[PDB]
From a paper:
Addressing the elusive specificity of cysteine cathepsins, which in contrast to caspases and trypsin-like proteases lack strict specificity determining P1 pocket, calls for innovative approaches. Hence, we set out to determine the crystal structures of cathepsin complexes with representative peptides of cleaved substrates. As a working model, cathepsin V was chosen because of the resolution of diffracting crystals (up to 1.3 Å) and crystal packing with accessible active site cleft. Reactive site mutants C25A and C25S of cathepsin V were used in structural studies.
The pattern I group (binding of cleaved peptide fragments to the non-primed side) consisted of structures of six peptides that were cleaved, and only their N-terminal fragments remained bound in the non-primed sites S4–S1. The MPD molecules were bound to the primed site region. Not unexpectedly, the cleaved peptides indicated that both cathepsin V mutants retained their residual proteolytic activity under crystallization conditions as observed previously.
Numbering used by the authors:
A (entry chain PA): 785 to 788
B (entry chain AA): 1 to 221
Amino acid sequence: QLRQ
Amino acid sequence: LPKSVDWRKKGYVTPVKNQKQCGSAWAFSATGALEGQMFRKTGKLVSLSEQNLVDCSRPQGNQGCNGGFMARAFQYVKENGGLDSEESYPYVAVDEICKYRPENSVAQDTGFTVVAPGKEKALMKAVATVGPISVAMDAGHSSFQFYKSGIYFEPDCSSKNLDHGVLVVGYGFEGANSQNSKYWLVKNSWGPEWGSNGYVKIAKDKNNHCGIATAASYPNV
Ligand SMILES: [Cl-]
Ligand SMILES: [Cl-]
């Protein structure tokens, strides 16, 4: 998962 | 087992890295675990290459910046015979040509060990006796994005539908009672600016919160  | 464990205090863990806009958390989780096992085997802490995993492990079923799995990464290092250092094969956060060089390899593994699925006490034992452990979690929450301090506990967390790979570097507890207010010490790959210097305390022994013990593994070196 990515940093949003 | 010990009441608390922190492999960072023993030299097993590299500083926090940043996957940036690439779905490569699985690779940082895998390099973190391999970093701690190579440290236990040799006494040298060497940062390993996530880019090497992203560019070269599609045959094992990984998809570079579109996702992957730590066990597939340990399978690649085994099948491949090695893994390059971060210094020699730098991270650029995009899918590129596999440039694996054996002469730059600083790690190897013979396969991996899986922690019994869903068992937090089994993960506790692996963490205490082995070193940092790769784990999958459900990180798909604004509360996780903006985490800063305290034991993270999110009602919307799933223990079965997971979307992020991270590294358990230890566990501990708050207060004087070691049997309550427990937490997993987790290294993330969102930079040291995210969370608490790049880390997060995730509720422990609260029914496998966010799935930390659902898909845990470590490389055999
Ligand atoms: Cl990711
Ligand atoms: Cl995995």
